[PDB]
Design a protein around this ligand. Structure first.
Ligand SMILES: Cc1cc2c(cc1C)N([C@H]1CCCS1)c1c([nH]c(=O)[nH]c1=O)N2C[C@H](O)[C@H](O)[C@H](O)COP(=O)(O)OP(=O)(O)OC[C@H]1O[C@@H](n2cnc3c(N)ncnc32)[C@H](O)[C@@H]1O
Ligand SMILES: NC(=O)C1=CN([C@@H]2O[C@H](COP(=O)(O)OP(=O)(O)OC[C@H]3O[C@@H](n4cnc5c(N)ncnc54)[C@H](O)[C@@H]3O)[C@@H](O)[C@H]2O)C=CC1
Length: 1216
């Protein structure tokens, strides 16, 4: 049995002083990074004046020679709107997918120009976001395909064949000659002769990036290898400076290129790069390693170090390496590289760039709650950093070859003059991008200009391949701060363009201040609350500190005892074992006797007045203190969750963050709402699951406590230790022992607590079956006021993702792998059914299976583990029986092989099962088991039906670029948490309030604004909770009431119409690159059980005002009270003799005395399907209290999270 965490995340090599200086700068405050950069970048007045004159001369040349884009001339010539321009280019792209040039011409002449283009040519507009950038300079995340179809029809009917021909020729020039140097390396090489004769050189990029499978990594490898041969053959001995080179991306060459997989990267990726470098060495060409995301920077240094020290590569100086000046570590990376160049004796080619991932780095740091960004946040800071880093490189030209890649004429001029008067080919060079930098560098290369060489970075690939880096380049070029946008911008003067960024930064009030409009991750929510803080598992200092803290957590004698108001209780004690290795004992639990569970409820009842008397803000302060304690203790809490719950470090971090967020969110929501009139329910029984043994545990308990209720906390029998630690933290933060009692044990303890007479409310997260058993036990009971005992139950889902042929396969696969198998599929939100449009199903399925086999399954105390065990042997048996049944029915089953070491724990291999029909799946399988179905596009609406038909409604994912498909699917799906173009897991508190409908639970949403209101007897008005919309059937009903003489009910109906929040439509603060929406809809059909005519009218007003239809109990005998309804109201009303036949319902309204309410409540609990949120009132309550039926519980909350960076960039952030 290996010692826990003994091999958690050992670094590839001991970190040298130079390496440690890199890591120390990773997220250094921006005000601290800039002053040394300002100083390093300072040049003399004489130099600065000379540089401005040279920069001015270059810009005047740029602005002086022929502008006027081909696309712009085409739009002008045919008077095209923007949408027609985009639509036309999409049409041209599609026409060019036809290889036979004559076949394309006949299609244009005989079918396209004549009329219905739809009949012949996967949406035509899949890539319209890219063409929209080409046409308008603006990036839209998704495609209004109905607008584009209308515009394409309009333009063809107006201008016919001539405009189509002009569009085809225009796209042919852009895609074949402007976006790529060539479609193949041999073609790109041919076209490079022209500019090589003028003094340029070339570096070829085989547009290849992010392998998701081993097969794709091998394909990219053989692409690079064949390109190296063709470039080396063409180089023909010209050497690494005058001759052409290649650029590679390491992420192309291995599907798991990350720090977490460092051992595989060094064992499997490194030999591949060495083999390519050996080939580049034989031909004597440059081989440059491109720079990618910030969390790959230091890992790439380990590969660079081995390669530069590998004697088999000696005698060749062509190895090159990109460093990104927008990165805070850039100068320290250069120190390391320059030192490595001295040690190895290799003159490393150093390409200095600004950086291509800025948008994505902002979003990622915010999502992960890290201390700061790894890039600058003001564009001018990157320019200073670049110039400062150029000074460092120019002082080391004897040992490195600097390559200044930039299209910024001011940056160029500053370096040109910084480099001084002595030059020779091989001292340094400039670089630019094909089709972008040649205007500028035609003013640089050659004896008649500045006589400095420029290497052109030449993308290579087919039209399909090119439509990826096309968005990045066009977005980076068209950003409001980008030099190439500003030079084209006529309002921008040359004086603005040649302004020295070094002197502008120096003269600022606070040097290096963060961008005003970008929130640090900790400040995402502004004044409302402090974001929880995460941990960077790519940071070697973090990994080293965490290794120590995780080991120490495994030395602790964790215990959980029955913690009653009076003190710890005795009981039967047993060990708690690591589900990944039963030999690893995590702690001991003493479980609660049934007698002591009943005693705990009585003590909670006795204590309830004293806890209720603590002012709401002071109850909130306890939560905020507990959040602080959990944040401080996160490393230790991580280690407990890893070993007790079988979770990976990554997921444990997110769980602790989520518990912190719950505490701070409910504290803020309390300070926003609760006053004296919002009295507590009383003792609340909180029953929690094992799969989020701290987050969901803490969330339910914190909400009940801060709402003024004492809590009986019953954690899952599998995970009592982290629960005991959470209660200990909450008590330490100030929750009295009598207000929070811990009762470890199995479902018998849970049931004793639920049955106890003083139990005033139940919060349950777990299986639907147990929730249904709890509901049935509570149906027998009423509160002191004679009202039903509230149950909040969140019960999981049968969650689907629909993927159409417009989605990007690699994005889909990554989101599918994460959604289905993260946490061994033990999330209620996990992806269970992937639905693939038939025309892309085979390709996506192939990549999915390939990505499945790259997952590492094992005991979770190693960073390299992706998927841990399932929680118990019984779970493992249940899941495996489902798999084998599917296999026995002939379904295709893909499974990864498990290592022998998993035998000591309870593991299920991640599994893909291909189904014929969604109806093949008849139960939630709570494991790492993804089911895949395929669908024809015309059957999309039927498929949405099939998804809804399961009766569940928790999470739902949609991958598509097409607005019509988004509007269709999101308006027809019935689920609580929607996700567009992203994964469907890890809902964030206050951002994606979490909770569903149907078989997925009662609501209200955890981490949402209606949650606390369910835990008090009089619900407060939540923040932002209102709507200006009035249900029109409600209004028709109120007029009908006035017509029948029911004046008071008519007034009460209109009041409900105004009070309803139906139609609330909010955007919630969150990370950049994402839009997080929160809306209130009708729940569905409300079961009405009235007793009196007036009671029925009030019930009907309540249901209609919230958008619902109704089924009214025919046994009430009140049919004569609804004679002559307007058809609009009639459409919403049905009468039910057999309630179970007319379901499912989405809620219920009951009128009666205490005995009648109990009888109806019991009958309702026996209705099959969803647990119904039931509201009850006496006739007198209805007459006295306008809120007798609370409208909070008659609407349905919906969260939708849309990844607006999905098209390849952040448009809003590019205007920053
Ligand atoms: C010419 C060239 C360029 C690259 C490459 C080769 C060659 C020959 N390789 C390539 C290999 C694979 C990807 S391409 C390469 C790159 N990139 C990469 O990451 N890895 C790589 O390997 N690039 C892209 C550059 O990093 C950079 O984005 C682009 O060139 C714009 O810089 P400019 O011409 O100085 O414009 P300019 O002076 O306009 O600056 C634009 C840049 O400023 C930065 N910026 C914008 N807003 C900012 C803000 N609010 N705060 C801070 N900074 C901000 C950002 O980096 C942006 O790109
Ligand atoms: N919605 C979610 O996030 C969760 C869903 N589940 C579902 O439940 C299955 C897990 O099996 P279990 O873990 O046994 O879930 P379970 O729902 O039985 O356990 C849930 C909680 O209820 C308690 N409990 C069990 N029977 C009870 C009863 N009769 N009265 C009162 N409390 C009772 C348990 O002790 C635990 O604290 C999974 O396969 C999955 O389908 C389980 C965990 C989380």
């Amino acid at each position: 049995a290996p010692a826990p965490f003994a091999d958690f995340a050992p670094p590839v090599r001991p970190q040298s002083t130079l390496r440690r200086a890199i890591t120390a700068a990773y997220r250094r405050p921006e005000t601290e990074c800039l002053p040394p950069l300002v100083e390093a970048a300072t040049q003399s007045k004489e130099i600065r004046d000379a540089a401005a004159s040279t920069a001015r001369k270059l810009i005047e040349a740029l602005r002086g020679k022929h502008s006027g884009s081909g696309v712009e001339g085409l739009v002008q010539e045919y008077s095209l709107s923007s949408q027609e321009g985009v639509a036309l280019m999409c049409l041209a792209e599609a026409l060019l997918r036809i290889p036979d040039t004559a076949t394309r011409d006949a299609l244009i002449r005989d079918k396209i120009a004549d009329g219905n283009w739809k009949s012949h040519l996967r949406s035509l507009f899949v890539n319209a976001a890219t063409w929209g950038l080409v046409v308008t300079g603006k990036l839209t995340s998704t495609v209004n395909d109905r607008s584009l179809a209308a515009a394409l029809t309009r333009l063809i009917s107006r201008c016919g064949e001539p405009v189509i021909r002009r569009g085809v020729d225009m796209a042919m020039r852009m895609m074949g000659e402007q976006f790529v140097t060539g479609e193949t390396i041999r073609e790109a090489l041919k076209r490079s002769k022209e500019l090589e004769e003028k003094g340029f050189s070339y570096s070829y990029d085989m547009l290849g990036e992010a392998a998701t499978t081993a097969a794709d990594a091998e394909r990219y490898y053989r692409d690079y290898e064949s390109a190296i041969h063709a470039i080396g053959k063409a180089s023909a001995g010209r050497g690494i400076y005058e001759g052409p080179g290649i650029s590679i991306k390491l992420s192309a060459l291995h599907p798991r290129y990350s720090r977490a997989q460092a051992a595989r990267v060094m064992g499997e990726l490194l030999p591949r790069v060495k083999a390519l470098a050996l080939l580049a060495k034989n031909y004597d060409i440059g081989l440059n390693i491109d720079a990618e995301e910030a969390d790959r920077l230091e890992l790439s240094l380990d590969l660079l170090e081995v390669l530069c020290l590998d004697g088999d590569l000696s005698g060749w100086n062509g190895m090159g390496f990109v460093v990104q000046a927008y990165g805070k570590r850039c100068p320290f990376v250069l120190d390391f590289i320059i030192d490595l160049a001295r040690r190895s004796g290799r003159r490393i080619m150093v390409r200095l760039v600004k950086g291509a991932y800025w948008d994505a780095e902002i979003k990622r740091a915010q999502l992960d709650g890290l201390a700061d960004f790894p890039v600058f946040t003001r564009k001018i800071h990157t320019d200073v950093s670049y110039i400062a880093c150029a000074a460092k490189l120019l002082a080391a030209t004897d040992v490195v070859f600097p390559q200044f890649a930039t299209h910024n004429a001011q940056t160029l001029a500053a370096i040109y003059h910084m480099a001084g008067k002595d030059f020779h080919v091989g001292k340094y060079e400039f670089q630019c991008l094909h089709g972008m930098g040649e205007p500028l560098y035609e003013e640089v290369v050659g004896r008649g200009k500045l006589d400095r060489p420029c290497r052109i970075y030449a993308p290579v690939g087919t039209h399909e391949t090119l439509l990826a880096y096309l968005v990045r380049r066009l977005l980076e070029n068209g950003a409001n701060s980008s030099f190439v946008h500003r030079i084209n911008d006529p309002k921008v003067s040359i004086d603005e363009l040649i302004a020295d960024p070094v002197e502008v930064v120096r003269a600022m009030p606070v040097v290096g201040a963060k961008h005003d409009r970008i929130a640090l991750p900790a400040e995402l929510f502004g004044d409302a609350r402090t974001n929880s803080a995460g941990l960077d598992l790519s940071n070697e200092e973090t990994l080293a500190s965490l290794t120590e803290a995780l080991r120490e957590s495994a030395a602790m004698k964790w215990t959980a005892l029955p913690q009653l108001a009076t003190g710890p209780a005795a009981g039967e004690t047993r060990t708690v074992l690591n589900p990944g290795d039963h030999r690893d004992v995590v702690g001991s639990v003493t479980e609660t006797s049934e007698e002591d569970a009943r005693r705990a409820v009585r003590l909670a009842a006795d204590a309830a007045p004293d806890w209720a008397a603590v002012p709401p803000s002071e109850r909130a302060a306890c939560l905020d203190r507990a959040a602080e304690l959990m944040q401080a203790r996160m490393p230790t809490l991580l280690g407990l969750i890893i070993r007790e719950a079988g979770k990976s470090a990554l997921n444990a971090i997110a769980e602790v963050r989520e518990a912190i967020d719950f505490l701070r969110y409910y504290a803020e929501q309390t300070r926003r709402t609760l006053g004296p009139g919002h009295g507590p329910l009383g003792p609340i029984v909180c029953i929690s699951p094992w799969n989020f043994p701290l987050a969901i545990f803490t969330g339910q308990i914190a909400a009940a406590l801060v709402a003024g209720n004492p809590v009986l906390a019953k954690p899952a029998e599998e995970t009592p230790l982290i629960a005991a630690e959470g209660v200990r933290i909450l008590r330490e933060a100030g929750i009295p022992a009598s207000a929070l009692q811990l009762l470890p044990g199995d479902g018998r303890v849970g049931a004793a607590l639920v049955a106890a007479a003083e139990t005033a409310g139940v919060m349950f997260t777990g299986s639907t079956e147990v929730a249904r058993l709890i509901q049935a036990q509570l149906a027998d009971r009423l509160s002191p006021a004679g009202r039903p005992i509230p149950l909040i139950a969140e019960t999981g889902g049968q969650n689907a993702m629909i993927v159409d042929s417009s989605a990007l396969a690699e994005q889909v696969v990554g989101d599918v792998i994460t959604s289905a198998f993260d946490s061994a599929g033990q999330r209620c939100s996990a992806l269970r059914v992937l639905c693939l449009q038939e025309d892309v199903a085979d390709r996506i399925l192939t990549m999915l299976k390939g990505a499945l086999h790259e997952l590492h399954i094992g005991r979770t105390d190693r960073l390299s583990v992706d998927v841990g065990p399932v929680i118990t042997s019984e779970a493992k048996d249940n899941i495996e029986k489902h798999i084998e049944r599917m296999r026995g029915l002939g379904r295709k089953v893909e499974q990864i092989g498990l290592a022998s070491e998993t035998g000591v724990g309870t593991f299920v291999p991640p599994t893909i099962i291909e189904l014929e029909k969604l109806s093949d799946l008849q139960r939630e399988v709570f494991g790492p088991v993804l089911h895949v179905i395929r669908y024809r596009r015309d059957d999309l609406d039927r498929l949405v039906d099939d998804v809804n038909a399961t009766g569940y409604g928790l999470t739902f994912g949609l991958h598509t670029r097409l607005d019509e498909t988004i509007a269709h699917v999101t308006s027809r799906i019935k689920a609580g948490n929607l996700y567009i173009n992203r994964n469907i897991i890890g809902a964030v508190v206050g951002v994606q309030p979490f909770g569903g409908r149907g078989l997925s639970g009662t609501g209200p949403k955890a981490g949402g604004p209606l949650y606390l209101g369910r835990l008090v007897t009089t619900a407060p008005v939540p923040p932002q909770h209102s709507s200006v919309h009035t249900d029109p059937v409600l209004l028709d009903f109120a007029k009908w009431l006035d017509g029948k003489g029911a004046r008071a009910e008519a007034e009460a109906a209109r009041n409900a119409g105004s009070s309803s929040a139906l139609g609330l439509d909010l955007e919630l603060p969150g990370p950049v690159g994402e839009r997080n929406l929160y809306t209130l809809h009708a729940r569905g059909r409300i079961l009405l059980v009235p007793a009196t005519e007036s009671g029925l009218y009030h019930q009907l007003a309540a249901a209609l005002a919230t958008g619902n239809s109704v089924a009214i109990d025919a046994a009430s005998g009140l049919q004569a009270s609804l004679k002559n309804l307007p058809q609009t109201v009639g459409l919403r009303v049905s009468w039910s003799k057999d309630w179970a036949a007319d379901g499912p319902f989405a809620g219920a309204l009951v009128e009666g005395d205490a005995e009648r309410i109990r009888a109806v409540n019991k009958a309702i609990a026996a209705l099959p399907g969803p647990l119904l949120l039931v509201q009850a009132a006496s006739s007198g309550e209805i007459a006295r209290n306008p809120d007798a039926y609370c409208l909070n519980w008659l609407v349905e909350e919906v969260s939708a999270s849309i990844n607006t960076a999905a098209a390849g960039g952040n448009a809003s952030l590019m205007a920053i």
